[PDB]
């Protein structure tokens, strides 16, 4: 079972990048994963990607430039206050002056500093670089 399609996402791109690819075929995929990857392309850790479609789940193809070292889901999807995101920074991020945990929230999906900017904090999704 693919209990989290978002988990049997980027683990696939771990098994592509650590094994040295430039793309992988992600199926299934959701708007969870679609907006997740739009956020990642907006940060530009990964590069250009395309959603191709069937009358089934759907596929995504990514064209990065290497800078995706590691991502991962932080399942279970913990619910975080404003001051407590910075706890989650120093546990599992490389340095202060880069690196993004991202969040799903009632303001959609954005990293924890846009949460600091647009002044909410919501449920965890993953850590991305």
């Amino acid at each position: 079972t693919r209990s989290s399609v978002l988990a049997d996402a980027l683990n696939a791109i771990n098994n592509a990048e650590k094994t040295g690819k430039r793309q992988v075929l992600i199926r299934p995929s959701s708007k969870v994963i679609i907006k997740f990857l739009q956020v990642m392309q907006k940060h530009g850790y990964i590069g250009e990607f395309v959603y191709i479609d069937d009358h089934r789940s759907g596929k995504i193809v990514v064209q990065l430039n290497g800078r995706l070292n590691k991502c991962g889901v932080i399942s279970p999807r913990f619910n975080v206050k404003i001051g407590d995101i910075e706890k989650w920074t120093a546990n599992l991020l490389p340095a202060r002056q880069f690196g993004y945990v991202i969040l799903t929230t009632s303001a959609g999906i954005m990293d924890h500093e846009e949460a600091r900017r647009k002044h909410v904090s919501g449920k965890i999704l993953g850590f991305v670089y």
């Binding site: 430039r22 793309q23 191709i52 089934r56 064209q63």
Partner: protein, 81 residues
């Protein structure tokens, strides 16, 4: 794989590789619109048939069902698509 999108591969490389593993899904088998030697009425049996066709004029069993695809009785005119 190096630099090509997978809308832009060598196309037919994965085309026979077990229908659903291809870049999208497309079924294996085919349709046939053929006519019996007893009526010359177009009797569309499926390629991978599971039903032994009694003729529409005769009572002749004009196919024998087998796995994979079925085994017709000879006398069926074929044509393309």
């Amino acid at each position: 794989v190096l630099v090509q999108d997978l809308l832009h591969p060598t196309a037919a490389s994965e085309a026979r590789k077990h229908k659903l593993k291809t870049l999208v899904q497309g079924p294996r088998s085919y349709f046939l619109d053929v006519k019996c030697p007893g009526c010359l009425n177009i009797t569309t049996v499926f390629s991978h048939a599971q039903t032994a066709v009694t003729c529409e004029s005769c009572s002749t069993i004009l196919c024998t069902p087998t796995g994979g695809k079925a085994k017709l009785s000879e006398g069926t005119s074929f044509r393309r698509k």
